[PDB]
């Protein structure tokens, strides 16, 4: 059970909302698990959009669905990347985002 | 901290739905944590049933409640095993399952 | 680099039992702190119990001063005041189950 990628970065939009993301990749024999962790202390009225690093973009793009369904305490999000820009869309406005994670396992 | 077990396997039901499960055991001094991770890209209309490996079955049986309450983004499930058949029951039909985990800690 | 990984069991005056695990990890310029919580019990109202010195300072260190946490059937907020942990819940919970709350900081 080896970790082959473990990166973290802070993204911010133009309205001053900020998120921290962590991308982790693990090998488990025949399987690989990829996990995205997300944290913000801010509220979100609508989608969060910000430039992501190339390594984070590459990680995000690799998902079989091409996006990441993610549960936060007060609502549901989908994280995607397009031309190096990360978007997190939310199911309802969130007074506070808090933390969540989203993973897939593949062989 | 030390990991004594970390296994993964893919299960499929008769109607084409597939889940990946990872079972992890960690020792934290006097405590042991056991975590089940579950992922499916598919939707679930009703309960998911499929044969589990002996090692996964033994892991799932060890829970103090004899089953695993698990949150997915769009609803709640309960994972149990009976005679080596894993069943995941869900609180509502799910257009997409996504990922979730369920753990317990014991002394 | 895991720089902290502690676990303890807490019980209230009504025999509800919780296990907590506090983990701190270092990822380059970032620190991640995760609180894991588990109870097999139901919870009618807030859970209060004394926490270790180490668990208390870990819980105090959050930028919001409290930990928003998702469980399968409802939402909680974990906080500490003078070594007493409180977990407040958004609705009564027939069973608590497991959840975790983390933050990532530069």
Residue numbers in the entry:
A (entry chain F), B (entry chain D): 238 to 344
C (entry chain E): 239 to 344
Sentences from the paper on this structure:
Trimeric fibre proteins protrude from each of the twelve vertices. These fibre proteins have an amino-terminal virus-binding sequence, a central shaft domain, and a globular, carboxy-terminal fibre head domain involved in initial receptor-binding. The SnAdV-1 fibre head is the first Atadenovirus protein structure to be solved at atomic resolution. Despite the low sequence identity with other fibre heads, the topology of the beta-sandwich is identical to that of known adenovirus fibre head structures and contains ABCJ and GHID beta-sheets (the E- and F-strands in the long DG-loop of human adenoviruses 5 and 2 are absent). However, it is significantly more compact, making the 107-amino acid long SnAdV-1 fibre head the smallest adenoviral fibre head structure known.
The structures of P212121 crystal forms were solved by molecular replacement using a trimer of the determined structure as a template and refined using NCS-restraints at 2.7 and 1.9 Å resolution, respectively. The two different crystal forms belonging to the orthorhombic space group P212121 both had four complete trimers in the asymmetric unit. When the structures of the fibre head monomer of the different crystal forms are superimposed, no significant differences in main chain conformations were observed. When trimers are superimposed, the r.m.s.d. is less than 0.5 Å, suggesting the orientation of the monomers in the trimer is also fixed.
